[PDB]
Amino acid sequence: IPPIPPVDFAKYGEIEEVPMTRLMQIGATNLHRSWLNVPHVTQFESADITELEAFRVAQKAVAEKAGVKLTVLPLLLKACAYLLKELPDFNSSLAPSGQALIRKKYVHIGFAVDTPDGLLVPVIRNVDQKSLLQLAAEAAELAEKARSKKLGADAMQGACFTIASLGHIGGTAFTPIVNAPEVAILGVSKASMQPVWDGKAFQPRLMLPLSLSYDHRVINGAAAARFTKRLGDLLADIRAILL
Amino acid sequence: IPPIPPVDFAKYGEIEEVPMTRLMQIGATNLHRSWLNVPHVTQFESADITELEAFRVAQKAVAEKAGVKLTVLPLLLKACAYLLKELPDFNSSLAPSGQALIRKKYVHIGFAVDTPDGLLVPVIRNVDQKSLLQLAAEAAELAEKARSKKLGADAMQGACFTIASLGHIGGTAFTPIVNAPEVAILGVSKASMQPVWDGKAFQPRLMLPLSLSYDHRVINGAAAARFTKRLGDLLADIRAILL
Protein backbone atom coordinates (compact mmCIF):
# COMPACT_ATOMS: atom_id res chain seq x y z
CA ILE A 1 0.00 0.00 0.00
CA PRO A 2 1.61 3.38 -0.91
CA PRO A 3 3.24 5.12 2.11
CA ILE A 4 2.59 8.63 3.16
CA PRO A 5 5.46 10.94 2.08
CA PRO A 6 7.52 12.32 5.06
CA VAL A 7 7.26 16.05 5.62
CA ASP A 8 9.87 18.13 7.43
CA PHE A 9 7.43 19.51 10.04
CA ALA A 10 9.99 21.79 11.53
CA LYS A 11 9.95 23.95 8.37
CA TYR A 12 6.67 25.43 9.63
CA GLY A 13 7.53 26.01 13.26
CA GLU A 14 8.70 24.39 16.47
CA ILE A 15 8.03 20.68 16.81
CA GLU A 16 8.63 18.23 19.64
CA GLU A 17 8.87 14.39 19.51
CA VAL A 18 6.96 12.39 22.07
CA PRO A 19 7.11 8.58 21.85
CA MET A 20 4.40 6.02 21.73
CA THR A 21 3.96 3.45 24.51
CA ARG A 22 4.34 -0.13 23.33
CA LEU A 23 0.59 -0.44 24.06
CA MET A 24 -0.22 2.35 21.53
CA GLN A 25 1.99 0.75 18.94
CA ILE A 26 0.38 -2.63 19.42
CA GLY A 27 -3.01 -0.95 19.21
CA ALA A 28 -1.98 1.00 16.13
CA THR A 29 -1.06 -2.23 14.34
CA ASN A 30 -4.12 -4.15 15.23
CA LEU A 31 -6.45 -1.31 14.06
CA HIS A 32 -4.67 -0.97 10.81
CA ARG A 33 -4.80 -4.75 10.24
CA SER A 34 -8.61 -4.72 10.93
CA TRP A 35 -9.17 -1.67 8.73
CA LEU A 36 -7.53 -3.23 5.68
CA ASN A 37 -9.11 -6.64 6.28
CA VAL A 38 -12.72 -5.94 7.20
CA PRO A 39 -15.05 -3.98 4.79
CA HIS A 40 -16.83 -1.92 7.44
CA VAL A 41 -20.40 -0.69 7.56
CA THR A 42 -21.95 1.12 10.56
CA GLN A 43 -25.65 0.79 11.31
CA PHE A 44 -27.04 3.51 13.55
CA GLU A 45 -30.14 3.09 15.80
CA SER A 46 -31.59 4.83 18.96
CA ALA A 47 -33.08 2.98 21.83
CA ASP A 48 -35.62 4.29 24.28
CA ILE A 49 -34.05 3.79 27.67
CA THR A 50 -36.51 5.93 29.78
CA GLU A 51 -37.77 2.93 31.69
CA LEU A 52 -34.34 1.24 31.85
CA GLU A 53 -33.01 4.44 33.39
CA ALA A 54 -35.76 4.57 35.96
CA PHE A 55 -34.97 0.93 36.85
CA ARG A 56 -31.19 1.63 37.17
CA VAL A 57 -31.76 4.55 39.47
CA ALA A 58 -34.37 2.76 41.62
CA GLN A 59 -31.96 -0.17 42.19
CA LYS A 60 -29.29 2.25 43.51
CA ALA A 61 -30.05 0.92 47.07
CA VAL A 62 -29.52 -2.76 46.17
CA ALA A 63 -26.43 -2.06 44.08
CA GLU A 64 -24.80 -0.07 46.97
CA LYS A 65 -25.76 -2.84 49.45
CA ALA A 66 -23.92 -5.18 47.09
CA GLY A 67 -20.94 -2.74 46.81
CA VAL A 68 -21.31 -2.49 42.98
CA LYS A 69 -22.23 0.55 40.92
CA LEU A 70 -24.95 -0.34 38.40
CA THR A 71 -24.33 1.63 35.25
CA VAL A 72 -25.76 1.09 31.77
CA LEU A 73 -22.89 -1.26 30.87
CA PRO A 74 -24.20 -4.50 32.67
CA LEU A 75 -27.64 -3.81 31.20
CA LEU A 76 -26.00 -3.49 27.74
CA LEU A 77 -23.89 -6.62 28.24
CA LYS A 78 -26.90 -8.71 29.32
CA ALA A 79 -28.99 -7.61 26.31
CA CYS A 80 -26.23 -8.17 23.73
CA ALA A 81 -25.56 -11.63 25.24
CA TYR A 82 -29.23 -12.56 24.84
CA LEU A 83 -29.09 -11.28 21.27
CA LEU A 84 -25.76 -12.95 20.42
CA LYS A 85 -27.61 -16.18 21.13
CA GLU A 86 -30.70 -15.26 19.10
CA LEU A 87 -28.76 -14.10 16.02
CA PRO A 88 -25.70 -16.46 16.03
CA ASP A 89 -23.93 -15.02 12.97
CA PHE A 90 -22.95 -12.09 15.15
CA ASN A 91 -21.33 -14.51 17.57
CA SER A 92 -19.00 -16.07 14.96
CA SER A 93 -15.77 -15.52 13.01
CA LEU A 94 -14.57 -16.07 9.47
CA ALA A 95 -12.57 -19.27 9.31
CA PRO A 96 -9.02 -18.70 7.78
CA SER A 97 -10.09 -20.67 4.64
CA GLY A 98 -12.38 -17.67 3.75
CA GLN A 99 -15.20 -20.22 3.23
CA ALA A 100 -16.63 -21.05 6.62
CA LEU A 101 -17.84 -19.23 9.68
CA ILE A 102 -16.85 -20.59 13.04
CA ARG A 103 -19.96 -20.18 15.19
CA LYS A 104 -19.05 -19.89 18.81
CA LYS A 105 -21.41 -21.59 21.27
CA TYR A 106 -20.17 -19.40 24.20
CA VAL A 107 -20.73 -15.65 24.79
CA HIS A 108 -17.68 -13.74 26.11
CA ILE A 109 -17.85 -9.93 25.53
CA GLY A 110 -15.04 -7.36 25.75
CA PHE A 111 -15.54 -3.70 26.61
CA ALA A 112 -13.21 -0.87 25.80
CA VAL A 113 -11.35 0.83 28.69
CA ASP A 114 -9.25 3.87 27.69
CA THR A 115 -6.22 4.03 30.01
CA PRO A 116 -3.12 6.45 29.87
CA ASP A 117 -1.01 3.86 28.26
CA GLY A 118 -3.61 3.01 25.59
CA LEU A 119 -6.79 1.01 24.93
CA LEU A 120 -7.44 -2.21 26.79
CA VAL A 121 -10.44 -4.49 26.07
CA PRO A 122 -10.94 -6.86 29.05
CA VAL A 123 -13.26 -9.78 28.41
CA ILE A 124 -16.09 -10.93 30.71
CA ARG A 125 -16.59 -14.65 30.08
CA ASN A 126 -20.06 -16.23 29.79
CA VAL A 127 -21.97 -12.95 30.03
CA ASP A 128 -25.13 -14.96 29.23
CA GLN A 129 -24.85 -16.68 32.60
CA LYS A 130 -24.20 -13.83 34.98
CA SER A 131 -26.64 -11.47 36.62
CA LEU A 132 -26.76 -7.69 36.44
CA LEU A 133 -25.03 -7.21 39.82
CA GLN A 134 -22.47 -9.96 38.95
CA LEU A 135 -21.57 -8.28 35.64
CA ALA A 136 -21.53 -4.90 37.49
CA ALA A 137 -18.98 -6.12 39.99
CA GLU A 138 -16.78 -7.83 37.48
CA ALA A 139 -16.82 -5.03 34.90
CA ALA A 140 -15.66 -2.64 37.66
CA GLU A 141 -12.89 -4.96 38.78
CA LEU A 142 -11.55 -5.56 35.27
CA ALA A 143 -11.55 -1.80 34.58
CA GLU A 144 -9.58 -1.05 37.79
CA LYS A 145 -7.05 -3.80 36.91
CA ALA A 146 -6.85 -2.40 33.37
CA ARG A 147 -6.02 1.11 34.65
CA SER A 148 -3.59 -0.16 37.18
CA LYS A 149 -1.64 -2.34 34.66
CA LYS A 150 -2.56 -5.42 36.62
CA LEU A 151 -4.72 -6.91 33.83
CA GLY A 152 -3.24 -10.30 32.87
CA ALA A 153 -3.25 -11.07 29.05
CA ASP A 154 -5.48 -14.05 29.83
CA ALA A 155 -8.41 -11.67 30.51
CA MET A 156 -7.85 -10.00 27.13
CA GLN A 157 -8.71 -13.11 25.16
CA GLY A 158 -11.36 -14.96 23.32
CA ALA A 159 -14.08 -12.30 23.17
CA CYS A 160 -16.90 -12.76 20.66
CA PHE A 161 -18.07 -9.16 20.53
CA THR A 162 -16.96 -5.72 21.90
CA ILE A 163 -19.01 -2.89 23.44
CA ALA A 164 -17.30 0.54 23.28
CA SER A 165 -19.18 3.10 25.44
CA LEU A 166 -18.39 6.81 25.21
CA GLY A 167 -21.70 7.95 26.62
CA HIS A 168 -19.90 9.26 29.73
CA ILE A 169 -17.96 11.80 27.60
CA GLY A 170 -20.22 12.93 24.76
CA GLY A 171 -21.20 12.55 21.20
CA THR A 172 -24.10 11.69 19.14
CA ALA A 173 -22.74 8.57 17.39
CA PHE A 174 -19.46 7.34 15.97
CA THR A 175 -18.28 4.63 13.57
CA PRO A 176 -16.12 2.12 15.64
CA ILE A 177 -13.61 -0.28 14.09
CA VAL A 178 -14.32 -4.02 14.33
CA ASN A 179 -11.72 -5.90 16.42
CA ALA A 180 -11.05 -8.67 13.91
CA PRO A 181 -11.44 -11.67 14.17
CA GLU A 182 -14.70 -10.61 15.77
CA VAL A 183 -17.37 -9.67 13.35
CA ALA A 184 -19.09 -6.66 15.06
CA ILE A 185 -18.57 -3.91 17.81
CA LEU A 186 -21.33 -1.79 19.42
CA GLY A 187 -20.50 1.84 19.99
CA VAL A 188 -22.74 3.63 22.56
CA SER A 189 -22.86 7.44 22.89
CA LYS A 190 -24.59 10.01 25.17
CA ALA A 191 -28.27 9.73 25.99
CA SER A 192 -30.44 12.83 25.41
CA MET A 193 -34.07 13.74 25.99
CA GLN A 194 -35.69 13.61 22.57
CA PRO A 195 -39.21 14.18 21.27
CA VAL A 196 -40.76 11.05 20.09
CA TRP A 197 -44.08 10.95 18.33
CA ASP A 198 -46.71 9.07 20.31
CA GLY A 199 -49.21 8.88 17.41
CA LYS A 200 -50.66 12.24 18.50
CA ALA A 201 -47.95 14.50 20.02
CA PHE A 202 -44.27 14.51 20.84
CA GLN A 203 -43.38 12.95 24.18
CA PRO A 204 -39.84 13.42 25.73
CA ARG A 205 -38.17 10.04 25.84
CA LEU A 206 -34.58 9.44 26.93
CA MET A 207 -32.83 8.04 23.85
CA LEU A 208 -29.52 6.09 23.74
CA PRO A 209 -27.53 6.36 20.40
CA LEU A 210 -26.17 2.94 19.23
CA SER A 211 -23.60 2.54 16.43
CA LEU A 212 -23.12 -1.05 15.33
CA SER A 213 -20.10 -1.47 12.99
CA TYR A 214 -19.90 -4.89 11.32
CA ASP A 215 -17.89 -7.01 8.95
CA HIS A 216 -19.95 -6.85 5.79
CA ARG A 217 -18.38 -10.10 4.40
CA VAL A 218 -20.11 -12.03 7.14
CA ILE A 219 -23.11 -9.75 8.00
CA ASN A 220 -25.37 -8.15 5.40
CA GLY A 221 -27.35 -4.91 5.79
CA ALA A 222 -30.69 -6.52 6.72
CA ALA A 223 -29.15 -8.71 9.43
CA ALA A 224 -27.40 -5.76 11.08
CA ALA A 225 -30.55 -3.57 10.88
CA ARG A 226 -32.46 -6.41 12.58
CA PHE A 227 -29.76 -6.69 15.25
CA THR A 228 -29.94 -2.97 16.28
CA LYS A 229 -33.76 -3.05 16.02
CA ARG A 230 -33.96 -6.08 18.40
CA LEU A 231 -31.41 -4.42 20.70
CA GLY A 232 -33.48 -1.20 20.78
CA ASP A 233 -36.51 -3.38 21.54
CA LEU A 234 -34.81 -5.26 24.37
CA LEU A 235 -33.46 -2.03 25.96
CA ALA A 236 -36.86 -0.36 25.84
CA ASP A 237 -38.20 -3.34 27.86
CA ILE A 238 -35.52 -5.51 29.41
CA ARG A 239 -38.16 -7.87 30.77
CA ALA A 240 -38.26 -9.45 27.31
CA ILE A 241 -34.98 -11.12 28.28
CA LEU A 242 -37.00 -13.15 30.78
CA LEU A 243 -39.06 -15.07 28.31
CA ILE B 1 -59.30 -38.18 67.81
CA PRO B 2 -63.06 -38.39 68.62
CA PRO B 3 -65.19 -39.39 65.58
CA ILE B 4 -68.18 -37.53 64.37
CA PRO B 5 -71.42 -39.29 65.44
CA PRO B 6 -73.39 -40.81 62.47
CA VAL B 7 -76.74 -39.22 61.75
CA ASP B 8 -79.59 -40.95 59.92
CA PHE B 9 -79.89 -38.28 57.20
CA ALA B 10 -82.91 -39.87 55.68
CA LYS B 11 -85.00 -38.91 58.76
CA TYR B 12 -85.12 -35.37 57.35
CA GLY B 13 -85.87 -36.10 53.72
CA GLU B 14 -84.71 -37.92 50.61
CA ILE B 15 -81.01 -38.68 50.40
CA GLU B 16 -78.88 -40.25 47.69
CA GLU B 17 -75.41 -41.89 47.99
CA VAL B 18 -72.78 -40.96 45.46
CA PRO B 19 -69.30 -42.50 45.83
CA MET B 20 -65.92 -40.92 45.98
CA THR B 21 -63.30 -41.58 43.30
CA ARG B 22 -60.15 -43.20 44.63
CA LEU B 23 -58.44 -39.87 43.81
CA MET B 24 -60.81 -37.98 46.20
CA GLN B 25 -60.21 -40.53 48.92
CA ILE B 26 -56.47 -40.30 48.53
CA GLY B 27 -56.77 -36.52 48.57
CA ALA B 28 -59.05 -36.64 51.61
CA THR B 29 -56.44 -38.61 53.55
CA ASN B 30 -53.50 -36.51 52.65
CA LEU B 31 -55.31 -33.25 53.64
CA HIS B 32 -56.37 -34.65 56.92
CA ARG B 33 -52.83 -35.90 57.64
CA SER B 34 -51.43 -32.38 56.85
CA TRP B 35 -54.11 -30.64 58.90
CA LEU B 36 -53.35 -32.62 62.06
CA ASN B 37 -49.59 -32.44 61.56
CA VAL B 38 -48.87 -28.86 60.51
CA PRO B 39 -49.90 -25.88 62.78
CA HIS B 40 -51.07 -23.58 60.00
CA VAL B 41 -50.89 -19.81 59.72
CA THR B 42 -51.91 -17.83 56.62
CA GLN B 43 -50.21 -14.55 55.77
CA PHE B 44 -52.16 -12.34 53.39
CA GLU B 45 -50.56 -9.70 51.08
CA SER B 46 -51.55 -7.84 47.81
CA ALA B 47 -49.20 -7.26 44.97
CA ASP B 48 -49.40 -4.52 42.41
CA ILE B 49 -49.43 -6.30 39.08
CA THR B 50 -50.45 -3.31 36.82
CA GLU B 51 -47.14 -3.32 35.00
CA LEU B 52 -46.84 -7.14 35.01
CA GLU B 53 -50.26 -7.25 33.37
CA ALA B 54 -49.29 -4.76 30.73
CA PHE B 55 -46.18 -6.87 30.01
CA ARG B 56 -48.22 -10.13 29.76
CA VAL B 57 -50.66 -8.62 27.33
CA ALA B 58 -47.98 -6.95 25.18
CA GLN B 59 -46.13 -10.29 24.79
CA LYS B 60 -49.33 -11.92 23.46
CA ALA B 61 -47.72 -11.86 19.93
CA VAL B 62 -44.52 -13.68 21.00
CA ALA B 63 -46.37 -16.20 23.14
CA GLU B 64 -48.75 -17.09 20.21
CA LYS B 65 -45.76 -17.32 17.83
CA ALA B 66 -44.32 -19.81 20.33
CA GLY B 67 -47.71 -21.66 20.59
CA VAL B 68 -47.91 -21.06 24.40
CA LYS B 69 -50.44 -19.01 26.31
CA LEU B 70 -48.68 -16.70 28.78
CA THR B 71 -50.82 -16.42 31.86
CA VAL B 72 -49.89 -15.16 35.33
CA LEU B 73 -48.79 -18.65 36.39
CA PRO B 74 -45.25 -18.71 34.69
CA LEU B 75 -44.66 -15.20 36.04
CA LEU B 76 -45.66 -16.46 39.53
CA LEU B 77 -43.51 -19.60 39.21
CA LYS B 78 -40.43 -17.62 38.14
CA ALA B 79 -40.76 -15.15 41.05
CA CYS B 80 -41.34 -17.82 43.72
CA ALA B 81 -38.33 -19.78 42.37
CA TYR B 82 -36.11 -16.70 42.71
CA LEU B 83 -37.45 -16.21 46.23
CA LEU B 84 -37.17 -19.89 47.23
CA LYS B 85 -33.46 -19.40 46.60
CA GLU B 86 -33.23 -16.10 48.51
CA LEU B 87 -35.11 -17.35 51.59
CA PRO B 88 -34.04 -21.06 51.76
CA ASP B 89 -36.13 -22.05 54.81
CA PHE B 90 -39.15 -21.97 52.53
CA ASN B 91 -37.44 -24.46 50.26
CA SER B 92 -36.93 -27.09 53.00
CA SER B 93 -38.69 -29.81 55.01
CA LEU B 94 -38.72 -30.98 58.60
CA ALA B 95 -36.50 -34.02 58.94
CA PRO B 96 -38.38 -37.04 60.55
CA SER B 97 -36.24 -36.65 63.74
CA GLY B 98 -38.20 -33.38 64.44
CA GLN B 99 -34.80 -31.68 64.99
CA ALA B 100 -33.41 -30.79 61.59
CA LEU B 101 -34.56 -29.12 58.43
CA ILE B 102 -33.57 -30.68 55.15
CA ARG B 103 -32.74 -27.73 52.91
CA LYS B 104 -33.25 -28.62 49.31
CA LYS B 105 -30.73 -27.15 46.85
CA TYR B 106 -33.14 -27.61 43.87
CA VAL B 107 -36.40 -25.73 43.12
CA HIS B 108 -39.27 -27.91 41.80
CA ILE B 109 -42.76 -26.32 42.22
CA GLY B 110 -46.18 -27.99 41.98
CA PHE B 111 -49.37 -26.20 40.95
CA ALA B 112 -52.89 -27.29 41.72
CA VAL B 113 -55.07 -28.51 38.81
CA ASP B 114 -58.70 -29.29 39.74
CA THR B 115 -59.91 -32.14 37.50
CA PRO B 116 -63.31 -34.12 37.63
CA ASP B 117 -61.73 -36.96 39.40
CA GLY B 118 -60.06 -34.76 42.03
CA LEU B 119 -57.04 -32.52 42.68
CA LEU B 120 -53.75 -33.18 40.94
CA VAL B 121 -50.55 -31.20 41.67
CA PRO B 122 -48.08 -31.74 38.77
CA VAL B 123 -44.52 -30.64 39.47
CA ILE B 124 -42.34 -28.53 37.14
CA ARG B 125 -38.72 -29.42 37.90
CA ASN B 126 -35.98 -26.77 38.17
CA VAL B 127 -38.30 -23.79 37.74
CA ASP B 128 -35.29 -21.57 38.53
CA GLN B 129 -33.70 -22.60 35.24
CA LYS B 130 -36.53 -22.25 32.77
CA SER B 131 -37.77 -19.17 30.96
CA LEU B 132 -41.24 -17.66 30.99
CA LEU B 133 -42.23 -19.23 27.65
CA GLN B 134 -40.65 -22.58 28.69
CA LEU B 135 -42.64 -22.67 31.96
CA ALA B 136 -45.74 -21.53 29.97
CA ALA B 137 -45.48 -24.45 27.59
CA GLU B 138 -44.77 -27.02 30.23
CA ALA B 139 -47.43 -25.85 32.69
CA ALA B 140 -50.01 -26.15 29.88
CA GLU B 141 -48.85 -29.63 28.93
CA LEU B 142 -48.88 -30.95 32.49
CA ALA B 143 -52.40 -29.53 33.03
CA GLU B 144 -53.74 -31.21 29.85
CA LYS B 145 -52.14 -34.54 30.90
CA ALA B 146 -53.61 -34.07 34.39
CA ARG B 147 -57.14 -33.59 32.99
CA SER B 148 -56.80 -36.42 30.58
CA LYS B 149 -55.57 -38.93 33.24
CA LYS B 150 -52.31 -39.30 31.38
CA LEU B 151 -50.20 -37.72 34.17
CA GLY B 152 -47.63 -40.32 35.31
CA ALA B 153 -47.02 -40.44 39.15
CA ASP B 154 -43.40 -39.50 38.44
CA ALA B 155 -44.51 -35.93 37.58
CA MET B 156 -46.36 -35.69 40.90
CA GLN B 157 -43.21 -35.97 42.97
CA GLY B 158 -40.56 -34.12 44.81
CA ALA B 159 -42.03 -30.60 44.78
CA CYS B 160 -40.62 -28.05 47.23
CA PHE B 161 -43.53 -25.63 47.18
CA THR B 162 -47.10 -25.44 45.70
CA ILE B 163 -48.92 -22.56 43.99
CA ALA B 164 -52.75 -22.87 44.06
CA SER B 165 -54.36 -20.26 41.75
CA LEU B 166 -58.11 -19.62 41.85
CA GLY B 167 -57.90 -16.18 40.30
CA HIS B 168 -59.69 -17.49 37.20
CA ILE B 169 -62.83 -18.27 39.27
CA GLY B 170 -63.13 -15.64 41.99
CA GLY B 171 -62.50 -14.73 45.55
CA THR B 172 -60.69 -12.27 47.56
CA ALA B 173 -58.35 -14.61 49.47
CA PHE B 174 -58.46 -18.05 51.03
CA THR B 175 -56.44 -20.05 53.57
CA PRO B 176 -54.86 -23.07 51.65
CA ILE B 177 -53.60 -26.22 53.37
CA VAL B 178 -49.86 -26.95 53.26
CA ASN B 179 -49.02 -30.15 51.33
CA ALA B 180 -46.77 -31.70 53.97
CA PRO B 181 -43.83 -32.45 53.82
CA GLU B 182 -43.56 -29.10 52.08
CA VAL B 183 -43.52 -26.18 54.39
CA ALA B 184 -45.62 -23.54 52.51
CA ILE B 185 -48.29 -23.12 49.67
CA LEU B 186 -49.19 -19.83 47.90
CA GLY B 187 -52.85 -19.29 47.21
CA VAL B 188 -53.61 -16.65 44.51
CA SER B 189 -57.10 -15.14 44.02
CA LYS B 190 -58.78 -12.68 41.59
CA ALA B 191 -57.14 -9.40 40.68
CA SER B 192 -59.22 -6.22 41.07
CA MET B 193 -58.70 -2.54 40.36
CA GLN B 194 -58.08 -0.94 43.73
CA PRO B 195 -57.34 2.60 44.91
CA VAL B 196 -53.89 2.92 46.17
CA TRP B 197 -52.61 6.04 47.84
CA ASP B 198 -49.84 7.71 45.88
CA GLY B 199 -48.82 10.08 48.71
CA LYS B 200 -51.36 12.62 47.44
CA ALA B 201 -54.43 10.87 45.91
CA PHE B 202 -55.78 7.43 45.19
CA GLN B 203 -54.57 5.89 41.94
CA PRO B 204 -56.27 2.72 40.47
CA ARG B 205 -53.76 -0.09 40.55
CA LEU B 206 -54.50 -3.69 39.58
CA MET B 207 -53.93 -5.70 42.76
CA LEU B 208 -53.36 -9.49 43.04
CA PRO B 209 -54.43 -11.11 46.42
CA LEU B 210 -51.80 -13.58 47.76
CA SER B 211 -52.45 -16.01 50.65
CA LEU B 212 -49.33 -17.73 51.91
CA SER B 213 -50.13 -20.59 54.34
CA TYR B 214 -47.07 -21.98 56.16
CA ASP B 215 -45.91 -24.53 58.66
CA HIS B 216 -45.38 -22.43 61.75
CA ARG B 217 -42.99 -25.04 63.32
CA VAL B 218 -40.48 -24.25 60.62
CA ILE B 219 -41.45 -20.66 59.58
CA ASN B 220 -42.18 -17.87 62.05
CA GLY B 221 -44.44 -14.85 61.48
CA ALA B 222 -41.68 -12.37 60.51
CA ALA B 223 -40.15 -14.73 57.94
CA ALA B 224 -43.48 -15.33 56.22
CA ALA B 225 -44.36 -11.58 56.24
CA ARG B 226 -40.97 -10.93 54.61
CA PHE B 227 -41.63 -13.65 52.03
CA THR B 228 -45.00 -12.15 50.85
CA LYS B 229 -43.51 -8.63 51.01
CA ARG B 230 -40.55 -9.65 48.74
CA LEU B 231 -42.98 -11.50 46.45
CA GLY B 232 -45.20 -8.40 46.18
CA ASP B 233 -42.03 -6.41 45.43
CA LEU B 234 -40.84 -8.81 42.72
CA LEU B 235 -44.29 -8.93 41.05
CA ALA B 236 -44.58 -5.15 41.01
CA ASP B 237 -41.27 -5.08 39.07
CA ILE B 238 -40.21 -8.44 37.69
CA ARG B 239 -37.00 -6.92 36.34
CA ALA B 240 -35.58 -7.27 39.86
CA ILE B 241 -35.22 -10.97 39.05
CA LEU B 242 -32.52 -9.95 36.58
CA LEU B 243 -30.05 -8.65 39.08
Side-chain angles (χ1 to χ4, degrees), chain A residues 1-21 23-59 61-63 66-68 70-98 100-143 145-149 151-243, chain B residues 1-21 23-59 61-63 66-68 70-98 100-143 145-149 151-243:
Chain A
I1 67 171
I4 303 297
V7 179
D8 188 285
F9 293 117
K11 301 188 196 268
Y12 304 107
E14 246 263 279
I15 60 162
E16 170 188 30
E17 291 156 77
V18 297
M20 255 157 97
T21 59
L23 234 193
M24 262 165 249
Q25 299 175 255
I26 295 305
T29 298
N30 289 310
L31 299 159
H32 204 198
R33 206 224 296 288
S34 296
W35 182 250
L36 290 178
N37 263 94
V38 180
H40 291 69
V41 177
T42 306
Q43 171 63 58
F44 301 100
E45 182 56 285
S46 294
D48 193 333
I49 51 156
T50 315
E51 289 310 292
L52 234 215
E53 191 60 7
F55 173 74
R56 239 205 74 224
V57 147
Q59 300 307 318
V62 183
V68 299
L70 169 72
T71 48
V72 77
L73 226 213
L75 292 146
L76 231 26
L77 293 159
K78 251 260 161 293
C80 298
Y82 179 87
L83 266 178
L84 248 23
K85 298 238 262 218
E86 191 187 299
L87 299 179
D89 295 344
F90 281 90
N91 191 27
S92 80
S93 305
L94 202 55
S97 42
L101 284 74
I102 293 151
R103 257 136 76 140
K104 301 172 187 189
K105 301 291 209 172
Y106 46 96
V107 183
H108 310 151
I109 297 179
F111 59 99
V113 178
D114 279 301
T115 89
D117 257 45
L119 180 70
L120 283 188
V121 189
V123 172
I124 296 176
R125 302 291 163 98
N126 303 298
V127 177
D128 58 322
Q129 282 155 27
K130 297 176 177 183
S131 68
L132 296 171
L133 295 183
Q134 292 183 72
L135 301 162
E138 204 176 334
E141 173 201 294
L142 288 174
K145 290 157 154 57
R147 282 181 204 117
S148 308
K149 297 93 196 303
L151 195 71
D154 170 53
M156 252 125 57
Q157 275 174 41
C160 314
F161 185 86
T162 305
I163 293 179
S165 182
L166 298 173
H168 57 102
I169 293 162
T172 266
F174 59 120
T175 55
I177 286 174
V178 176
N179 297 312
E182 298 165 27
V183 107
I185 177 174
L186 214 221
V188 191
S189 301
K190 198 205 205 82
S192 322
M193 212 77 199
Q194 292 297 314
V196 175
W197 188 245
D198 80 318
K200 204 68 181 197
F202 285 110
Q203 249 41 281
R205 291 326 227 80
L206 176 71
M207 295 278 135
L208 180 66
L210 305 167
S211 309
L212 180 82
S213 289
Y214 53 93
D215 185 333
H216 201 4
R217 298 172 301 177
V218 177
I219 280 131
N220 52 282
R226 196 167 304 281
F227 184 99
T228 49
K229 202 245 180 61
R230 286 289 284 145
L231 185 57
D233 285 350
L234 293 179
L235 293 183
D237 195 359
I238 196 67
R239 293 174 296 194
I241 271 181
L242 255 12
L243 79 176
Chain B
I1 67 171
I4 303 297
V7 179
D8 188 285
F9 293 117
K11 301 188 196 268
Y12 304 107
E14 246 263 279
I15 60 162
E16 170 188 30
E17 291 156 77
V18 297
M20 255 157 97
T21 59
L23 234 193
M24 262 165 249
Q25 299 175 255
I26 295 305
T29 298
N30 289 310
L31 299 159
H32 204 198
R33 206 224 296 288
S34 296
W35 182 250
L36 290 178
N37 263 94
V38 180
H40 291 69
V41 177
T42 306
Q43 171 63 58
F44 301 100
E45 182 56 285
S46 294
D48 193 333
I49 51 156
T50 315
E51 289 310 292
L52 234 215
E53 191 60 7
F55 173 74
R56 239 205 74 224
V57 147
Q59 300 307 318
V62 183
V68 299
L70 169 72
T71 48
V72 77
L73 226 213
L75 292 146
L76 231 26
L77 293 159
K78 251 260 161 293
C80 298
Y82 179 87
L83 266 178
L84 248 23
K85 298 238 262 218
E86 191 187 299
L87 299 179
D89 295 344
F90 281 90
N91 191 27
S92 80
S93 305
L94 202 55
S97 42
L101 284 74
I102 293 151
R103 257 136 76 140
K104 301 172 187 189
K105 301 291 209 172
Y106 46 96
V107 183
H108 310 151
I109 297 179
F111 59 99
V113 178
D114 279 301
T115 89
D117 257 45
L119 180 70
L120 283 188
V121 189
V123 172
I124 296 176
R125 302 291 163 98
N126 303 298
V127 177
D128 58 322
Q129 282 155 27
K130 297 176 177 183
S131 68
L132 296 171
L133 295 183
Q134 292 183 72
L135 301 162
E138 204 176 334
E141 173 201 294
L142 288 174
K145 290 157 154 57
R147 282 181 204 117
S148 308
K149 297 93 196 303
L151 195 71
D154 170 53
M156 252 125 57
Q157 275 174 41
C160 314
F161 185 86
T162 305
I163 293 179
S165 182
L166 298 173
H168 57 102
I169 293 162
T172 266
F174 59 120
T175 55
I177 286 174
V178 176
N179 297 312
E182 298 165 27
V183 107
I185 177 174
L186 214 221
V188 191
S189 301
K190 198 205 205 82
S192 322
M193 212 77 199
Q194 292 297 314
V196 175
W197 188 245
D198 80 318
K200 204 68 181 197
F202 285 110
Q203 249 41 281
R205 291 326 227 80
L206 176 71
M207 295 278 135
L208 180 66
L210 305 167
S211 309
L212 180 82
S213 289
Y214 53 93
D215 185 333
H216 201 4
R217 298 172 301 177
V218 177
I219 280 131
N220 52 282
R226 196 167 304 281
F227 184 99
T228 49
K229 202 245 180 61
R230 286 289 284 145
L231 185 57
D233 285 350
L234 293 179
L235 293 183
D237 195 359
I238 196 67
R239 293 174 296 194
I241 271 181
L242 255 12
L243 79 176

